[PDB]
Amino acid sequence: METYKVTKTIRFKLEAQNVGLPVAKASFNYYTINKKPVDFGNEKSELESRLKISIDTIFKLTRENFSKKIEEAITADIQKELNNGKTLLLGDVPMLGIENYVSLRQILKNIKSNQKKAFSDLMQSGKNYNELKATNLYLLNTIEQRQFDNYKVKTNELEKLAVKINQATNDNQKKELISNKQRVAKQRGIIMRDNFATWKSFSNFYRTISQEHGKILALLKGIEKERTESQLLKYWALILENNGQHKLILIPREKAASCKQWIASLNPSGDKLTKLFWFESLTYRSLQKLCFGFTENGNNKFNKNIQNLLPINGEFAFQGDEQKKIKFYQSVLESKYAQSVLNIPIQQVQADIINQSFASLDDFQIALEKICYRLFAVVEANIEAELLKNDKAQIFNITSSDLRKEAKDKIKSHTQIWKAFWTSENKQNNFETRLNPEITITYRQPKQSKIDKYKNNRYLHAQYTLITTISEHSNSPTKILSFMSDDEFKSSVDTFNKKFKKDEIKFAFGIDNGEVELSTLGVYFPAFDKTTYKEKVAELEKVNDYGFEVLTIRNLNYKETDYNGKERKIIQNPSYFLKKENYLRTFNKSETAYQKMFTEQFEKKKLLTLDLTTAKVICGHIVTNGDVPALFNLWLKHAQRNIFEMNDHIQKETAKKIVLKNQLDTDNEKLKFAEYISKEKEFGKLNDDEKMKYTKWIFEDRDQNNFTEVENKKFKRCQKIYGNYSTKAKAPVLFASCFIDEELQSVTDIFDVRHIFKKREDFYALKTEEEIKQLIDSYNTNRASHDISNEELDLKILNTKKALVANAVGVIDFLYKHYERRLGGEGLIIKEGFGTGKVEDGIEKFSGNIYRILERKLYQKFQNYGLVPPIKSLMAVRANGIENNKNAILQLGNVGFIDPAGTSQECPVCIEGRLEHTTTCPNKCGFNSERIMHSNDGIASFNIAKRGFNNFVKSKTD
RNA sequence: AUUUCUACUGUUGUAGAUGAGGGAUCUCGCUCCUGGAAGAUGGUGAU
RNA sequence: AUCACCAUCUUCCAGGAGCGAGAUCCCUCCAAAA
RNA sequence: ACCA
Ligand SMILES: [Mg+2]
Ligand SMILES: [Mg+2]
């Protein structure tokens, strides 16, 4: 479909020849080397109008509710300060320069601080409830005496603990500390955090005010920082091409004036295996700065002339008429003065801009940029030394790994673009791929943690890196988002959604997000929907013509020895067994050997679904088992974090102890865990005798026990973290228990239990069972959270969570291209709209959920094709899910969202039936998922796609 | 062994992904500095 | 036997700054002729 | 919707 301009930041390496922190920044265009700060006059005068507040309108900035007395008290407290003619602001901003101003955020902080100061003194000193009710602490007043006593019991207990600790000796001191920290201080803090209603409400109100202020604080901070970021340009840059390779020349502005003049006299003499390029261009965004930029001061010499062309002054004169603006700009280019100082190609502009007529301003911008962008070329004998002599030019070599290897046709995309920029054909499209006129250089020190311990390596020595920005699709409409109001982004999305047409779409992808399979994919086409069921079943059965072809590894332990005697395993890197050259080179085998190995090790089949947990693209084939290590790394990082966050990390020693286990031993531990898993309601109501049968139900094999209807009545309704915890489960679980007593006798105070790891089958192909030794070294009580630095422990889960998404986006894009080059039309990506309420629950249950990251990476992927609009504030548009509506659909470009109700069990053909088991509908229709889907778990994704398609077309009917 | 990340890894390096810099608000874990309160212990003064 | 004070010491609370993890968010990345 |  029709695209729009897109930007990316690509970088290379530089090798110095003649001479992180910004060592240098440069601009190819010679006329942006003396920049001046942007004209933000409007926004500065507009944001002050949002800062100012009128006292009486404060309480309507929040959803919270305060009684009238508290409202009056707060207003009185603020008025106490607003005397002497001060004016109130939503916050303090030293950059705008306001004075005699009073910050509301500071006052809200102070009235909270003073009261939390007085309340502690009152509670500590030993006053009474009636004394409290007579104080001026209007926030803490009116608490139930029950809470007051609940708090003072802990206070006095703590008091006791204090003097106990002072006269301490020996290991006793360790058992005291924990009892002081773990149970008393934390419980007391939570009591006041989550039970004092007015306190909670005021905390929420202050939070909302603080966030609101922070927004328009960040905006203004960026506005100010732009004023100083734009003074660091000093160099004019050139690219000297030779023998098919580029150099990089930086020349200071002290000499650019003479250097360009000298270069202008060079003779263009074809190709001699050496060229000295230099860029020139003008843009619409710069003409407005030229004409209506800083006009109020009157020193804009471009407005000492040209005024006759004006209607009165200032860009606001045009009132917003596109065709008056177009004509004024054409006249500006038509003026005698403008052509005397500008450097545009007068002939082509005159024959193609001034004389023409444009339908809209977008085309005027496109034509101006298209015709004003030039890439010159000159050549002369040994043209390197004159620069070093006359102009003191610094010189680097631009390089990278892909720019030095023998074979080509297999090269990284970010190098593909740079290779494609210089092609001759690209000069005849008017530079569709554009290299923007500003670039930067950075210098990185070596890692001492690598030097000391140490075989080529990046980090073993310093590096010079070049960062450049490249704009693809330079001849399509532009789109920018700075300073748009929140209500304009939604309108932008709605307008951009109009491009799609009802009969344009031809298929859809449905994606399901579980927790045993982190995600699942399925494909739907309109051809599946025949009239009779007998036709639907047959249409589905033709898997050979619809589904896609996938390879499955047959033996994950297979290994082979290469010529060096080293051994290699298939699981770690299958790409050394699928590609031909790699196998024949490394293992020195013959053609027949390769054919036999390929025919014996890998199975292949065509299906309608998949399982994105481990699928990967290897040498053009989709391997369903090509990415086990990336899943193991995630299931290991989750456990390593969990077993480190349940310790304690105070400086002073403590006796908290924790251990790993395969099963729980003492009934205290089982009773603690069962409580950790169940809902507080329907559990505390559970009889103290049945709390043992519940443990037997959770932790035994369920085969030798005669559990009655109680299981459905009670056990299955109070469980909120589902799973299988038996000893013979498919993926046996591995536990961590925490206590203090030395030997864990049958009567000990265990005060935490959790389930850490899942022993997924086929993890043993990488690591033996004993490699829980790895899961432990990352837990240690003595460690202080402040001390722990990177490169000795790593708690990050972001990278290991982006790895799986990186492997899944490849599969999804490959399938999208495959089907689009067969059906002739674009398709929709459908996933259910959980919103924000359920995303947090999903994170809680596992903490490695991939939903939001996968969505945020699909948006990044599919923008390049021009299929979703630019995104500014994602939470603005949705902020929530789609519930209780089985027809609605939320659309961002080609990415849809729907309600997930009743999708995971309905039969694709019979609808009314339910298909939780046997892979055949109980209604006895012809449906049978044996030869279609990888398992019975894919039926959700299919449905997720199905409902995604039918609804979308339904939206276009009117 | 990489502009950068992940799995490998040296007879041409291999398979997937890649928009980077600086900053704002909030939640959780910790440390140093200054101030307030409760209190343990040796000593000194006093009625 | 009681009351005031000096000094070492324990805990909790408030404010300032810094480190580690997660969530939401923002701006910059093309201008000038004497 | 997440799951012996
Ligand atoms: Mg689902
Ligand atoms: Mg699922």
Side-chain angles (χ1 to χ4, degrees):
Chain A
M1 291 215 318
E2 54 271 38
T3 63
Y4 52 84
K5 191 170 182 178
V6 165
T7 307
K8 298 168 183 173
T9 303
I10 82 179
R11 19 197 195 160
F12 306 127
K13 178 159 64 144
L14 293 188
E15 292 275 3
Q17 297 287 263
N18 181 54
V19 299
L21 308 97
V23 178
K25 193 168 172 163
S27 94
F28 291 107
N29 194 335
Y30 166 88
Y31 302 75
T32 76
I33 199 157
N34 259 270
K35 194 181 297 184
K36 275 190 290 184
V38 186
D39 204 2
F40 281 119
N42 300 93
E43 280 71 18
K44 277 196 168 186
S45 205
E46 204 286 318
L47 289 154
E48 52 86 10
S49 147
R50 302 186 43 220
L51 268 168
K52 287 167 191 179
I53 282 277
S54 65
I55 285 167
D56 299 334
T57 56
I58 177 188
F59 284 108
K60 279 317 307 171
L61 291 173
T62 179
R63 164 70 31 71
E64 290 286 14
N65 318 328
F66 291 124
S67 306
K68 200 70 192 169
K69 215 172 62 173
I70 295 154
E71 290 194 352
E72 295 168 9
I74 285 168
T75 46
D77 279 332
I78 289 159
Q79 187 54 224
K80 194 179 291 162
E81 286 293 334
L82 311 183
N83 292 305
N84 329 314
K86 264 53 168 164
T87 191
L88 186 69
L89 305 178
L90 190 60
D92 50 27
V93 295
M95 318 101 85
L96 252 73
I98 315 107
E99 291 202 354
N100 288 285
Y101 71 91
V102 171
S103 163
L104 175 59
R105 188 173 177 254
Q106 191 79 344
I107 280 172
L108 286 175
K109 167 178 277 281
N110 275 352
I111 72 185
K112 204 167 74 77
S113 172
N114 291 346
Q115 296 210 353
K116 177 51 179 292
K117 188 85 169 293
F119 177 93
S120 84
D121 307 24
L122 178 140
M123 210 69 138
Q124 203 165 22
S125 67
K127 281 188 177 178
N128 190 356
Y129 186 71
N130 303 100
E131 299 179 287
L132 171 67
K133 307 307 277 300
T135 60
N136 192 23
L137 319 184
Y138 51 77
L139 298 179
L140 283 307
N141 279 42
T142 72
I143 50 168
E144 299 166 35
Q145 191 215 304
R146 138 182 299 279
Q147 298 153 341
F148 186 96
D149 286 340
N150 268 268
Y151 197 105
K152 206 164 201 301
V153 164
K154 258 81 165 68
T155 295
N156 77 11
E157 175 168 0
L158 180 131
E159 176 190 324
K160 228 155 292 305
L161 271 301
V163 299
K164 277 190 180 297
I165 298 160
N166 177 74
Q167 67 203 285
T169 299
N170 77 62
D171 320 319
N172 265 9
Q173 200 162 4
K174 300 182 199 156
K175 190 184 310 311
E176 310 291 5
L177 286 148
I178 207 74
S179 195
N180 159 276
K181 169 176 160 64
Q182 173 49 229
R183 281 181 164 160
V184 168
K186 261 54 176 137
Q187 287 173 356
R188 185 178 65 150
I190 295 321
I191 275 174
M192 162 145 58
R193 195 189 68 199
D194 304 3
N195 293 353
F196 289 29
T198 306
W199 194 246
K200 183 193 293 189
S201 148
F202 190 78
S203 297
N204 286 357
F205 169 52
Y206 170 75
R207 266 200 275 266
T208 288
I209 283 285
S210 203
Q211 191 198 49
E212 184 80 30
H213 157 64
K215 198 189 298 296
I216 70 188
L217 172 53
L219 250 71
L220 283 166
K221 192 170 306 317
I223 277 173
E224 163 295 312
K225 184 192 260 270
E226 162 47 10
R227 180 171 60 75
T228 191
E229 189 84 329
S230 57
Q231 294 322 78
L232 313 191
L233 283 77
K234 179 51 87 193
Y235 292 7
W236 193 50
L238 283 80
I239 208 80
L240 185 154
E241 189 180 284
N242 94 347
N243 75 266
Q245 218 83 342
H246 313 301
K247 287 196 181 329
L248 162 62
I249 280 59
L250 314 171
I251 164 165
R253 174 91 181 70
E254 299 180 310
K255 306 270 189 36
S258 68
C259 186
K260 190 183 186 184
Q261 187 267 9
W262 178 67
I263 273 168
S265 193
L266 279 280
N267 307 301
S269 193
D271 192 339
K272 311 197 197 304
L273 211 63
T274 288
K275 311 181 188 69
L276 177 78
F277 304 126
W278 39 295
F279 292 70
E280 278 275 10
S281 190
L282 187 139
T283 181
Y284 174 72
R285 185 180 157 295
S286 77
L287 199 61
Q288 280 177 338
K289 274 262 300 193
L290 252 179
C291 290
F292 302 119
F294 293 0
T295 187
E296 306 299 347
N297 188 41
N299 205 36
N300 205 2
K301 296 176 181 178
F302 216 80
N303 285 346
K304 241 62 188 169
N305 311 72
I306 276 288
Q307 313 104 307
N308 309 306
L309 291 308
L310 303 165
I312 179 63
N313 186 30
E315 164 55 11
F316 46 78
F318 294 102
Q319 176 265 328
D321 199 354
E322 273 204 290
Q323 300 301 351
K324 292 180 179 181
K325 218 185 303 200
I326 289 273
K327 183 59 215 171
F328 171 74
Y329 282 123
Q330 280 176 303
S331 80
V332 177
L333 298 171
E334 211 176 350
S335 175
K336 204 42 61 183
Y337 179 65
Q339 301 176 8
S340 186
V341 296
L342 297 182
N343 198 326
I344 42 66
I346 172 56
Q347 297 320 80
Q348 183 151 18
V349 164
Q350 166 83 88
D352 215 311
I353 278 174
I354 300 186
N355 305 29
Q356 301 297 323
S357 61
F358 305 96
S360 63
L361 196 130
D362 293 343
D363 201 333
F364 184 68
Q365 165 168 23
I366 292 156
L368 184 68
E369 280 243 26
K370 181 200 307 187
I371 290 154
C372 293
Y373 191 79
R374 285 150 291 164
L375 179 74
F376 281 70
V378 305
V379 50
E380 162 162 313
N382 81 333
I383 176 59
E384 181 172 322
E386 275 67 20
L387 306 190
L388 287 86
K389 147 61 165 174
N390 306 293
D391 313 335
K392 209 72 206 90
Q394 339 296 293
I395 303 196
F396 304 80
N397 282 348
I398 281 159
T399 182
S400 61
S401 165
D402 281 351
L403 256 58
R404 292 189 282 106
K405 76 187 195 181
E406 174 183 31
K408 276 69 152 180
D409 87 339
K410 190 46 57 191
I411 203 158
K412 291 186 287 192
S413 190
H414 273 210
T415 307
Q416 206 155 266
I417 292 163
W418 178 265
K419 280 282 185 181
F421 177 46
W422 304 106
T423 58
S424 305
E425 58 90 10
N426 203 36
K427 184 158 183 173
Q428 298 177 6
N429 294 329
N430 305 307
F431 294 91
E432 193 101 356
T433 295
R434 212 151 296 205
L435 173 145
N436 281 34
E438 263 217 25
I439 59 137
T440 204
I441 300 166
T442 69
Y443 182 74
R444 187 193 67 206
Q445 305 279 358
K447 276 182 181 280
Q448 276 295 344
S449 55
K450 267 62 157 77
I451 285 168
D452 58 352
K453 59 193 294 183
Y454 311 141
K455 203 180 189 68
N456 202 18
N457 190 294
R458 310 165 294 294
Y459 294 111
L460 208 61
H461 42 257
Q463 161 161 306
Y464 271 93
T465 299
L466 164 77
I467 311 172
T468 74
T469 168
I470 281 185
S471 317
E472 267 185 340
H473 297 138
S474 313
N475 297 326
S476 293
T478 195
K479 284 183 160 58
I480 197 162
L481 308 156
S482 307
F483 299 104
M484 271 155 38
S485 190
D486 165 30
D487 284 335
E488 293 217 68
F489 163 64
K490 294 175 286 189
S491 179
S492 167
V493 168
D494 185 16
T495 297
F496 184 99
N497 295 358
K498 287 180 180 178
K499 295 162 63 173
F500 299 78
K501 293 298 201 294
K502 171 269 209 168
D503 50 349
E504 175 51 30
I505 305 332
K506 310 294 195 187
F507 67 97
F509 285 3
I511 297 180
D512 175 35
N513 173 287
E515 256 151 20
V516 68
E517 289 169 3
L518 291 177
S519 280
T520 324
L521 168 67
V523 187
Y524 177 93
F525 303 139
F528 292 123
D529 168 14
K530 290 332 188 143
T531 78
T532 73
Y533 306 169
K534 191 74 167 186
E535 290 162 297
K536 293 192 197 291
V537 63
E539 198 75 355
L540 287 168
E541 183 54 30
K542 294 174 188 164
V543 166
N544 292 304
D545 312 348
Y546 300 123
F548 43 87
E549 182 183 326
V550 292
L551 301 181
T552 304
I553 313 185
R554 196 175 269 154
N555 178 358
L556 302 116
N557 304 278
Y558 172 51
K559 76 192 79 59
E560 193 93 8
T561 171
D562 65 35
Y563 57 75
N564 272 319
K566 197 162 176 167
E567 288 202 307
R568 297 195 191 221
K569 308 178 172 62
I570 196 153
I571 206 64
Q572 288 179 292
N573 201 351
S575 73
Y576 271 73
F577 284 71
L578 275 155
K579 209 177 175 182
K580 188 74 154 302
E581 300 97 284
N582 284 345
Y583 191 71
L584 290 166
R585 218 221 313 177
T586 289
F587 292 117
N588 224 355
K589 247 67 186 289
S590 71
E591 272 288 354
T592 310
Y594 172 91
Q595 293 294 354
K596 175 54 55 53
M597 173 220 81
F598 191 104
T599 304
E600 189 139 310
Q601 293 299 336
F602 300 74
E603 179 178 292
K604 56 151 57 59
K605 63 272 196 174
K606 306 186 75 164
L607 287 172
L608 298 191
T609 77
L610 192 43
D611 181 0
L612 296 177
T613 318
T614 52
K616 187 172 179 186
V617 163
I618 290 177
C619 326
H621 296 277
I622 284 166
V623 193
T624 65
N625 303 10
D627 194 29
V628 165
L631 179 67
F632 183 75
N633 275 15
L634 186 63
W635 264 106
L636 190 75
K637 193 56 55 183
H638 153 85
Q640 284 190 334
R641 277 167 136 254
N642 262 27
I643 192 140
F644 179 92
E645 266 148 30
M646 104 176 58
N647 264 270
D648 65 12
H649 312 79
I650 45 162
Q651 189 79 8
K652 304 159 185 169
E653 64 264 32
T654 184
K656 197 167 190 178
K657 181 155 30 58
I658 172 166
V659 290
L660 269 85
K661 301 188 175 190
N662 298 310
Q663 71 286 304
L664 305 180
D665 321 330
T666 319
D667 295 342
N668 285 12
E669 283 169 309
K670 296 180 181 181
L671 271 306
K672 178 56 184 183
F673 180 82
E675 151 175 0
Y676 164 68
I677 293 307
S678 297
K679 306 170 188 166
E680 79 287 11
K681 62 95 180 171
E682 200 75 36
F683 179 58
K685 286 51 170 173
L686 202 163
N687 178 286
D688 194 29
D689 170 30
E690 286 285 20
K691 281 186 177 182
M692 271 325 308
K693 186 132 163 203
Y694 185 28
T695 292
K696 286 172 68 66
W697 190 83
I698 290 169
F699 275 87
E700 283 206 32
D701 294 88
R702 199 84 62 69
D703 317 282
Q704 318 90 347
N705 295 272
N706 303 99
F707 285 110
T708 171
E709 303 185 335
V710 68
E711 50 167 339
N712 171 45
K713 211 79 178 179
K714 308 188 187 181
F715 298 159
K716 206 145 67 203
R717 284 170 52 253
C718 34
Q719 187 166 222
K720 73 170 173 68
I721 296 187
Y722 295 89
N724 192 325
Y725 302 104
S726 309
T727 51
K728 67 182 190 76
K730 161 57 191 169
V733 55
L734 170 153
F735 292 101
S737 310
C738 156
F739 57 64
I740 280 162
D741 198 358
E742 279 284 20
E743 59 167 32
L744 166 40
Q745 290 111 343
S746 191
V747 67
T748 43
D749 207 2
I750 302 113
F751 54 68
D752 206 353
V753 185
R754 217 175 298 190
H755 79 88
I756 288 281
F757 194 93
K758 295 286 197 79
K759 300 181 192 183
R760 189 189 183 83
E761 175 65 341
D762 79 67
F763 271 154
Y764 298 114
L766 294 171
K767 301 288 174 58
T768 173
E769 163 49 28
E770 283 300 310
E771 295 304 337
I772 58 174
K773 279 157 34 221
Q774 213 164 0
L775 207 148
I776 277 174
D777 75 338
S778 198
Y779 94 75
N780 42 5
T781 325
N782 302 75
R783 181 76 68 173
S785 183
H786 79 86
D787 163 68
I788 187 59
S789 71
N790 211 281
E791 305 105 355
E792 68 186 72
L793 293 183
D794 195 22
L795 313 181
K796 300 260 275 202
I797 198 157
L798 207 60
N799 277 11
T800 61
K801 204 147 70 168
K802 278 174 187 172
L804 288 181
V805 176
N807 288 187
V809 79
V811 171
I812 274 164
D813 179 61
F814 178 87
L815 290 169
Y816 183 90
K817 285 169 169 161
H818 178 188
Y819 279 111
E820 189 265 321
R821 296 203 290 229
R822 173 140 66 106
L823 277 289
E826 310 89 41
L828 294 165
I829 317 307
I830 304 293
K831 66 169 62 52
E832 71 265 60
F834 287 142
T836 196
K838 193 169 185 300
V839 177
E840 276 100 39
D841 171 58
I843 283 163
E844 242 173 41
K845 283 194 194 208
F846 175 40
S847 99
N849 224 49
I850 211 78
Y851 179 89
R852 186 74 83 208
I853 279 281
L854 190 50
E855 169 177 15
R856 277 196 181 274
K857 286 283 161 191
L858 278 175
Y859 294 157
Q860 183 176 3
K861 179 57 165 181
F862 276 96
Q863 276 174 10
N864 271 209
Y865 308 159
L867 288 168
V868 316
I871 286 168
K872 205 177 82 85
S873 56
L874 186 67
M875 285 299 102
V877 63
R878 44 192 313 222
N880 56 41
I882 298 173
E883 281 56 30
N884 318 122
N885 188 334
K886 287 189 181 178
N887 293 324
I889 193 162
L890 178 139
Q891 175 168 3
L892 289 99
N894 81 332
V895 176
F897 289 81
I898 53 160
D899 157 79
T903 59
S904 197
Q905 292 192 351
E906 73 180 33
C907 188
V909 173
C910 317
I911 309 109
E912 153 267 308
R914 297 289 175 266
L915 181 53
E916 68 260 61
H917 277 295
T918 318
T919 71
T920 179
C921 187
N923 283 189
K924 311 300 303 195
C925 287
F927 180 75
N928 184 4
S929 192
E930 282 321 287
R931 308 304 311 115
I932 312 173
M933 321 145 163
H934 66 318
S935 179
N936 201 73
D937 314 65
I939 288 163
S941 88
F942 193 73
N943 294 327
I944 283 163
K946 185 177 182 187
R947 187 176 298 174
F949 194 94
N950 290 353
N951 300 149
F952 152 87
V953 74
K954 191 181 292 296
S955 81
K956 298 288 191 277
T957 290
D958 52 11

